[PDB]
Symmetry: C2
Subunit: 262 residues, 2 copies
């Protein structure tokens, strides 16, 4: 069991024999523009370069795509990844636009996804914006859906990749139901101009340990996209103030993290 932080929410995961590339964003440093209608629009994306070359990321059994925002799936990854690569997608909408980009080996993943060997991937709901944001029609379609992944196995520990979501009840029900020993949160604190936080921040790391004390949080989706304000040093400082230093890991780009089972 080896979870590795690449850049933003791009992750490499070894889990029960198989390997997964989660949300591959592989543009060069400052290739495309900053997000309009968000914080720090002057900063170009991505802010940081990749910690390792592209060929190392392609050596993977399947790509998993939580949603099709540009920081999770860019023009570079469309060019770079083979069209016969096994892409897991959130829904038919996502699969349809990936199909029109030239890809064809696609499995639209669903609430429960079982493998004979004992692997089980679950697809969990979130909310990529505030209750106020989704009252708007236009911004609703733009922020859209963005799932979280729960990987279960008998030989391995349960890990929960929560995805681009703010604190909503479906996140709470997912923690209670799956009781995950490891939790990966997108803790960038990305600010929309007129509706505020579209994903989690520092406070959501406290809230989750209050909800699930035995869990160990891995903070991702940070220092990469222009609107993500919450830096690594600030979260690390927030850890110390609440007495939760060893329970919050803040991996650097390229940092592999290992977790045993029994």
């Amino acid at each position: 069991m080896k979870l590795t932080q690449i850049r933003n929410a791009t992750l490499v995961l070894q889990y029960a024999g198989k390997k997964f590339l989660i949300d591959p964003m592989l543009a060069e440093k400052e290739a495309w523009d900053g997000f309009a209608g968000s914080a720090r629009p002057h900063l170009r994306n991505p802010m940081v370069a990749l910690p390792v070359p592209v060929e190392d990321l392609l050596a993977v059994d399947a790509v998993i795509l939580t949603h099709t925002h540009t920081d999770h799936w860019d023009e570079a990854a469309q060019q770079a990844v083979p069209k016969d690569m096994l892409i897991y997608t959130q829904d038919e909408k996502d699969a349809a636009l990936i199909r029109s980009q030239g890809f064809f080996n696609i499995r639209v993943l669903k609430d429960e996804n079982h493998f004979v060997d004992g692997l089980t991937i679950y697809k969990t709901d979130g909310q990529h914006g505030s209750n106020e944001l989704y009252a708007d029609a236009q911004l609703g379609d733009l922020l859209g859906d963005a799932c979280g992944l729960v990987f279960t196995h008998h030989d391995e520990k349960t890990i929960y990749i929560a995805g681009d979501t703010v604190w909503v009840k479906p996140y709470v029900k997912s923690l209670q139901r799956f009781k995950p020993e490891i939790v990966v949160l997108n803790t960038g604190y990305a600010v929309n101009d007129l509706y505020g936080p579209i994903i989690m921040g520092k406070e959501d790391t406290l809230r989750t340990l209050k909800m699930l004390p035995t869990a160990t949080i891995v903070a991702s989706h940070m220092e990469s996209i222009n609107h993500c304000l919450l830096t690594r040093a600030e979260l690390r400082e927030f850890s110390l103030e609440h007495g939760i230093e060893d329970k919050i890991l803040i991996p650097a780009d390229g940092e592999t993290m290992a977790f045993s089972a029994w």
Copy 2:
């Protein structure tokens, strides 16, 4: 259809040749006598009496409970509804509770409930509170889960009882998916002291109709318990203001509305 507003979220729904009683609150006017030792016990609930006798309410094929909050399922209803009645519950814990209160003919609503007759009943996920409220683990369990209900059938228009939820995207996706001609909202505007509104209000009437302008809104869950701060008169005054007065139905207690697909 024939939807009858009873009082609060209590209503009877004649749909596809079958009658249901959704969320029965059957206590008399100001009759909730639950007491431990309060110095200033509020004796306002229920604010209004039943507009019809209890006998008329029970002439029904099954009861449907969105959740077990007292304003949807009180002790009076737990006594008055017979134990051999078919009760449809939201999930396993509410079924267990209802079963341990003497009832034995209980069923749990799945996410989809396709019956051979052609009637389909979809269970919806809401949020009974703000995002902040559910960060509190104590108030998470207290407000808990509370499901919406869609009813689907040919020969009949599609109706969505949203239930005790504030505006979250699972509510928006339900309007986008099922596309109901009738959306029944719980517009009490009950508010938590520090964490803001716990159910829908006047604002949520307009935001739906912008999303789905064909639809007709039936207002409900108000002027029954004192904690619901929205008045009949205020919502009508709000509807006249934004030019939607004849699309916002605000029925009296006991009023029945007909909704036919053909005639």
